[PDB]
Design a protein around this nucleic acid. Structure first.
Lengths: 83, 81
DNA sequence: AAATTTGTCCGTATACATTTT
DNA sequence: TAAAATGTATACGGACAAATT
């Protein structure tokens, strides 16, 4: 019964994607609407966590996934960037 | 190296929790209180008796399997190598 | 069967290490 | 130089997945 995110139990079609996946969708949206152009910086990990209201590890999980599929690349001490 | 309780003239340190668990388990083995192919206490038992999280237990045990002191069988249990 | 037990996923918190800037 | 930003380590919690017993 894949946990995902659940607001409530009863009836229907059930509930939301995990937090990190929601974050993934948002970031990937920024890239694919071109609000963030190739080689440009995404708002940082700290910033991201303050705006999304999630842990740094949730942010890092989303970003890491997006790096693995090659949409982002990150530079230690530098920042994170559009691929 | 990682832990403390902060006081003057120096700083008081202790091993991280998982390290303490490691020492305990490995001492059980090296004193022969547990013999090859015998199972150690379950991760659940260990967390309840040591008062730490299942991940602290799993971390210690993981380090001890990497050394070949232990081996675990999923659904089976954990054993002295 | 179905309960135990170990394995992995998801989420949170704090501290410190490593590089850039 | 330090500050900032990413990386890894140490904890904790809950829920689910997989294989044994």
């Amino acid at each position: 019964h894949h946990l995902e995110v659940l607001f409530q139990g009863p009836l229907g079609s059930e509930f939301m994607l995990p937090k990190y996946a929601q974050v993934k969708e948002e970031i990937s949206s920024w890239i694919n609407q071109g609000k963030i152009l190739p080689d440009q910086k995404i708002p940082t990990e700290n910033e991201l966590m303050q705006q999304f209201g999630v842990s740094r590890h949730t942010i890092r999980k989303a970003i890491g996934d997006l790096v693995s599929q090659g949409l982002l690349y990150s530079v230690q001490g530098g920042g994170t960037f559009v691929a």
